[PDB]
Symmetry: C4
Subunit: 105 residues, 4 copies
């Protein structure tokens, strides 16, 4: 019952994902391959949010579908709830992907 | 249903707007046209909050009605929920305007 | 109805007050009159929380009843909701007072 | 009734504990006895969260059961609600312990 509150975390990951992948500073950085700017635009967020991890991705999936969702992977030391939202340009084309991760022990 | 929870974000934007536009440090900076102080009093808030963007405005609307509200603009890559609250002096005169933005993909 | 949600803010101020006035680093600083340490232990919290203001006080009320509560002052540009909790030593003696402020336009 | 909302704080401590003890940067630091990295990976969190205190521990309990829970100690100046979650390796072996503390006056 208390653990069933995955949506407690799941919804946090979702919104957070939508917001982080929507930031113009990140949108700019992702386009210009400014891994430096990206690094300075996420590190703070880590300690800020109670998110186990955060990840910025490229259109191909490289390690710097118009729809946002929540991923749930179960196995070993609980399960990981990771919200995911795409990074769009002014035309909507998927230029990247944000994946904020969470954990429920 | 899960998306219908715009008030989830909308209420965050509202309160945040009321608070940010109420800060004395910002009130001081907005009056003295201290764009420098303003810049150092908002940048942190960006990474802090899950707000897509934040904006400080002047009485005229320049880019540094006694009532606060939420704005909703729909079109292209979801919709943007932006809470808005005026910046007042000790007399209540509208000296500025804060507009915290959010996004729902 | 939406505005009636003062407890939304009021409860934030309350908890925040209890926590900030409970921190050992602040407890230490308040005792040793380390206004410097106090200054470095509150400034971050300002931008962090959506609190209009935050205040540390002395047992007398100086500007650096075993019970916590919420204060509500109405007039001019909305009302100010300020949670208040005392700073205790290891014996419970009131050595200070924390007053986190909020605003509802 | 308002005070009975310990789960308000208790649940915050729980999740926060699960997340902080799950961070790879901390997992790495705890294994390599990198008290320096740990120090730079927790200090921010202190001011960030409304947590009275935060603590990282070793498998033995040193001061740097596969299950997470909430601790409640009552006495003198209210009670302390401290969420607790273990630090695991890629095999699940308990390598540490995180204990985020809270207070209810």
């Amino acid at each position: 019952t208390e653990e069933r509150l995955h949506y407690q975390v799941g919804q946090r990951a979702l919104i957070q994902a939508m917001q982080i992948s929507a930031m113009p500073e990140l949108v700019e950085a992702v386009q210009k391959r400014d891994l430096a700017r990206i690094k300075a635009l996420i590190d703070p967020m880590r300690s800020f949010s109670d998110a186990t991890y955060i990840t910025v991705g490229d259109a191909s999936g490289q390690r710097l579908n118009a729809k946002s969702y929540v991923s749930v992977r179960k196995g070993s030391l609980g399960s990981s709830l990771r919200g995911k939202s795409p990074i769009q340009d002014a035309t909507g084309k998927v230029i990247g992907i944000v994946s904020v991760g969470y954990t429920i022990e």
